[PDB]
Amino acid sequence: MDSTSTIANKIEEYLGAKSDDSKIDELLKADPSEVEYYRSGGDGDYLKNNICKITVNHSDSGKYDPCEKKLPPYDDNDQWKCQQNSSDGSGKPENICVPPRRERLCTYNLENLKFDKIRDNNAFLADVLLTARNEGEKIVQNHPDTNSSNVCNALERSFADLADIIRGTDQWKGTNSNLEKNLKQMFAKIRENDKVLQDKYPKDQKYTKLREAWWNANRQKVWEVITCGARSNDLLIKRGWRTSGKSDRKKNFELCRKCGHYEKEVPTKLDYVPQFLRWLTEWIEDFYREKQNLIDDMERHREECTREDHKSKEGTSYCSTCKDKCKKYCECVKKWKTEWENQENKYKDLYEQNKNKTSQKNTSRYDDYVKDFFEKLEANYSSLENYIKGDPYFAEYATKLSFILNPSDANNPSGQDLLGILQENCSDNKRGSSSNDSCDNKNQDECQKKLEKVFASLTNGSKKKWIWKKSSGNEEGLQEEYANTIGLPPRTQSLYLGNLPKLENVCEDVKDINFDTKEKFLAGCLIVSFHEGKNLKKRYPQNKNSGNKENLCKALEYSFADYGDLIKGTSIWDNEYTKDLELNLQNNFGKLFGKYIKKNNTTSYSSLDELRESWWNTKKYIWTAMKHGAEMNITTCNDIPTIDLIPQYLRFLQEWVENFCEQRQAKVKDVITNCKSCKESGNKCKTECKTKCKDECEKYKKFIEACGTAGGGIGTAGSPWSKRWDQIYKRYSKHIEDAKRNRKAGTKNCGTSSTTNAAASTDENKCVQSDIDSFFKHLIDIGLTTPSSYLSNVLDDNICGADKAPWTTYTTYTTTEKCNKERDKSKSQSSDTLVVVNVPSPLGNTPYRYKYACQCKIPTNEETCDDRKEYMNQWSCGSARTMKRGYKNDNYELCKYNGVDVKPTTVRSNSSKLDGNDVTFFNLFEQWNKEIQYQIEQYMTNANISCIDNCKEKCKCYKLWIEKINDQWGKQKDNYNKFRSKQIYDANKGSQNKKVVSLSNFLFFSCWEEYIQKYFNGDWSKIKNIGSDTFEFLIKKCGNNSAHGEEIFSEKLKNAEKKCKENESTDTNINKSETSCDLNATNYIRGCQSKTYDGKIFPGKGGEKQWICKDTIIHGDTNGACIPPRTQNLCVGELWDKSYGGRSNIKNDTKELLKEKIKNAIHKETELLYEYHDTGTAIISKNDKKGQKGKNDPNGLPKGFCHAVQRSFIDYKNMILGTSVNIYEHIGKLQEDIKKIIEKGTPQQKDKIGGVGSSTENVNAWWKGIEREMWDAVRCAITKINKKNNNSIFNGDECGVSPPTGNDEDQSVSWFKEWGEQFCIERLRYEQNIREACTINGKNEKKCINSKSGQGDKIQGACKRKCEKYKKYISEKKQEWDKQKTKYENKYVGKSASDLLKENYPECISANFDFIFNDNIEYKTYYPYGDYSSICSCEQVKYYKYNNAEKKNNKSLCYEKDNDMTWSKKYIKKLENGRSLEGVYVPPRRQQLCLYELFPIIIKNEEGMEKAKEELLETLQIVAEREAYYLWKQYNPTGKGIDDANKKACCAIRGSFYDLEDIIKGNDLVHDEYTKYIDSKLNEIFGSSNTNDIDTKRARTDWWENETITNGTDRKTIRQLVWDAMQSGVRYAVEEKNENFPLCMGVEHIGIAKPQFIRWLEEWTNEFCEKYTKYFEDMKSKCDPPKRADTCGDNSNIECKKACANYTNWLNPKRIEWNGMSNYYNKIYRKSNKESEDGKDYSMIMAPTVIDYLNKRCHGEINGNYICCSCKNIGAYNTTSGTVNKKLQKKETECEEEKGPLDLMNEVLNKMDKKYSAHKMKCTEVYLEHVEEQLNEIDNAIKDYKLYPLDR
């Protein structure tokens, strides 16, 4: 044993392992993890995520694969002249017989491997990976053999060839020789530069000895790369003996006889032998195997005798015809056999030179490694291990040699084809099943025959725990891809066939091979099926069933499907018998049915797997045998179950969930029976338990939370239900992701944003491909994206338990970790280790609704609100969300926020200033002020809308937190009272700071600062305090001057009303007396006989009035809105008159006279409006262009009198009161005559009291309550007018009992609304005219509006007459509208003109005011006719490529992207099925996204479908190009950083691309003025609206994704076209800047789009991190004390003020935004389409908390692709992992891990982290000084705004 050598077979693994001698191989192994492989489109992260999916995109695309030899395919085959010749030197026609041994490798097209920049191991191994992947694909996919036990040997041969190429030992080398010397020299020169990292001290550099170490170091990587493409049925290592072998060794892992693909270690140790000798197997073994196959396979028996009938052809005639007509002309083809059997023996005939050591006629290259065979094989003993004798397979072809004699006998005797198609419908659910399913195949060739119903025959001859364990490494388990994922059922591991190592052991009576024919094989399979049925009959009945068969039928179905998967080879689980039964099955199915395997290159069978799948699809006989086997039979309960087509993982999931549900029902029945209070769970709180019902709840909790042994039921393995469910969810989401990223599937209808696919393969209409990926793809688009939804769909109903606990919902609780093992000792590891929050679907520790019904007592009204989560909890210790800690004393009541611990440490403080706890109180209080103001504003408007639809949740979850927030405001004001009391010392010292300024004053500052921050771009712009005329609203919102901020909360809490109430209500009273109005003879009114302001009534036209805009001489400056023509022609009655200048007819009378005058005036004007709208003479009344007869409103009576009478009432009201802009007849005299002449001395008496003083402020406040006396008259008139025209049969009503609405207080807004409605109606009429003009002059001859060139197809009068009037109308209306929108926005603030107009009138939905009245000269140039330019300007919009006379500058353009916009929650979609309140925020980049080009085409293509798609595609491409160009212009030149700017710009462009894709697919979360109409019209176009909404969305998604456009350049989908357009825009920007094209954005493949909310969240996180870093660095550079003192330093205490103010102002709204984002995430994560709040799925989100998800995403460094966010030292301190290691004290490190200090996200927003705690005091005091100064400024500003009473 002392003569051990180093040959590395089985014993040199631990003794001879000298590879890892020094720390060099660890860095020598190649890890291709560098981002952006060249500029062709490679990426490191894609390769790291999966090594098996490497493509040619890692270098120049489409032009790399070995052996660039240009042999053209379809003219010749096997024609080469390369090697040598002697007589025909011109070429090499035929001088050597090259075998097809290596010529069949992936060696055909485009080995253009010459490019440079390959410098390191990352770039070095890329070509090796490409070669390995390509050779594996070529050797596996199209393999002419019958898929026998030779694919492993073929892959081994390919790997040996690759190893020889790398080592250079290969002898037959072609064009790769130039690289081989290049690798030996260039890659030597580029790898020897790092002399520090390598120990090449011996001369010279040890090139070979270092490259061999490099290859040994990366031995594994190339192994899994080359084996990536192989199928799981490889079954490597030829030794197939059952659980043993001729070379018995120790137990290491499950190498028997599989698990090499996932082994992560080399299985083939035969490559470590000296490779010089290793190369003999290439010559001999391949010929041996091929000849052994040739001699035996084509034996076609003697069935071609042509006895029954004469046959012209026999299929194979080898001896019957040819050898009878002649002797050997057709059979004597074996001549290559003294190199095989007559050319064989040129291998081992070198024994002539005996005893042969030193070779003198060879080369000297250190041949000591090959000197072994000098004596080892010639004249030495051959007594060694079994690797030479016994282990190799040398006699397996019926060998009967008698080379040895053994007289002793002490051993006992041993003891062309059809291919049908089917569309059987799977029903994997019990609900309505709104969709269907399908399958394929069926053979009708591989079967029994006929004459079914064969029965009888008999007498042919305890793992009961779920193996949820790692992969089968020793005896049992699952597959490597399925390890610890789903768990193996006991029935599945105890099924009969899985226990049989070979199929030939089916029958005990016969003990030899019996499967030689198809029927013979099927007979054994049927025997196995019958045995399984009998075994299940023995097992299940009759203990778990009450005489029925549902359990028995379920077990038979599951076992039937498991047999199907096992015989198909798609089994996901393994035992000791499996992987040998599979090998025997494959050997049988290769020996039998081998002829049908012909379709290797294109009915026949493509491969062996499809053949086996087809055989199994011939399953009715097997199912009938299984069914008849046990007791099911016939005449007791009588089709084929569809359970088998469902994937085995899903079947295992359903079985495990059914087991868990049965156990849960057993454990919850007692809980339901007992936990009732007296007879129901909710009743009496006292003695809720009858005696001790808590024991049942304790049992349930123990069952749920056990570790599999402390009370838990059968199932799992030492792990909780929660852990097992999490593993299941992870595996299921991985399957969903793989299906979505798959390329091949059947016919489906994609309708999800997170989907991409090019081709869908199927042969039948509306059929899925029946594969696992296709089945998961079909699972997608009907929901079912999560296990919760899938199980909710497939489960029966009440099997989950007596309590209805649907799997869709999620219930959260808190629990202690398993008590068997304590993490890192006990009593000091952490607090959360004992308390961890869990959130599964109804796996909670309580039976769903009995969270509070259990453990006695009933849920209080306070905690029911928390359960409903309608009003979330934010603060803890005395709050807007319940609970309080006190105490009523001096110090100190603080409103602590949830989840963050308040730190009262006063060590941060200094002397003579505020205390640390007071500063923390101030910060907490200002945050509380902001958040509570926001929440009151949000929740004050909801009211839940009733009815429809205690009285809802306004008694609970409302009117409770109102009182409790009143209490919280009282607490906060009491605490601030103590805070302000600190002026006993500092008030005189710092007069006048008040130490500090009072609470009401601070609230005033807070609201003013809130206004300034939004409307003046930051609080730092408070110097620009000129608010123009927005003060009135602002002083209304903030109170007149200071010392009234307390009143702000007083009002904001006293207005918590207007609902509940309710009460009953008081409705309904009666109308107001009295009708009368029968005196139609109202005399004549000199004012107006007819309001002919919109022309005259037919007959006769003319006299149209015009909108009196501002700057009119009669109204002075007129800063208000325009005067309506109806108001201009208003029927004043007998009050005002003309012909005498200003005449007041009613001058000496009282108001008693004018009620009759106003009454008959409104009567006549209303009766005219009833006639002014029947004839359509009013602009508001007239709709479309036919008139009011052909086109009429639906509401029973002409549209435009209810609004007209409302406007008349409003303008009469302001006529009495005094309008903002007096109209025409100087209304005021009425406003100073019955308090002067007709407003004169009424009702206040003229008798003065006191005297001159206190006499001029008691008279001017009376006329506000006298205006109500006219609405009754209006009601009487409007009811009376409709009731004379009884000529047609109808009653007098506008649209039924519907009355005119109220809220008639607003007047200028009413005028604006009237103007907007009239403008929209006129625009619709003009649009109809333009469409008519575009349809006319265009006939069947395809004429185009009579256009000639000219300068293209321009209009010259056909539709120009119709469109120029529209153009001038838009011009004048823009003139009127830019002067009204500004006034309305300044008056109301926060309400845009469009968001006011659109909802009040349906006709405004088609108008985008921003685009129509865009203020841009480029807009005027490119859109001469406004939004209808595309209809009129018919130039056939056409997106031009990057080159060949591009037209971008001459094309339509927009403005540059804004850089400092704020996140806004406006324009969020209003989801149907209300109370779906989204808390999301639109990114600035998305809300500034330019899509203005779409809108004209969107308007144009309303009619004329099948033409919209081309125009839409073109405009989308040009928009994407311009968007990429402007985003690059916004990002890249702002700092010329080569990497940061480029990567940030590319990430932003990818985000914009994904947002555009979501807009197209309809998954966008924003409905602004643009995208709302874009989505509406896209829905109208796609599907033509004749389908449903889901169908429309699916059509849109399919159109975006599939290859829809037919182009002459390959088959590029619309998504690819848009990405290419964005790339072209980036190229334009780069060329303009004269830079280099970015390394990223060169990717042709764009990844799967994450959900829009998640992308927005990641963008928000990245922006927040960058802004936080910038602002904190500014603060640390400025607010930190100077190095040369402060008083005498370079600072003036001003730049620190600026930095602190900027930081606080930026951080204040970010907390609210993050709170909203987290609130939405906590309700959206881990949800599918059917359960998420929105329709889109979120199954890819696997993270309990948003912070954890961000840590999983933001931990790394941004690269430009996929990774779009990063965090550096945010929050905590400038140090990342790692500082302290837990290994040195107690294993292991359990964080785990922090992954960047992003967990401080919640704490930093409360200004509580250490980084801000360093500068909190100075920032706070500076903020307070700023507060005082700006109150001074604002008060002075208001006093100056008073202005008027000073001088003239």
Numbering used by the authors: 1 to 415, 496 to 541, 554 to 694, 699 to 714, 716 to 735, 749 to 1059, 1092 to 1990
Provide the authors' original text about this structure.
They are composed of a short and conserved intracellular domain, a transmembrane domain and a large, polymorphic ectodomain. Extensive efforts to resolve the molecular basis of VAR2CSA binding, established the CS binding site to be contained within the region spanning ID1-DBL2-ID2.
Alignment of the models shows no major conformational changes on VAR2CSA upon PAM1.4 Fab binding.
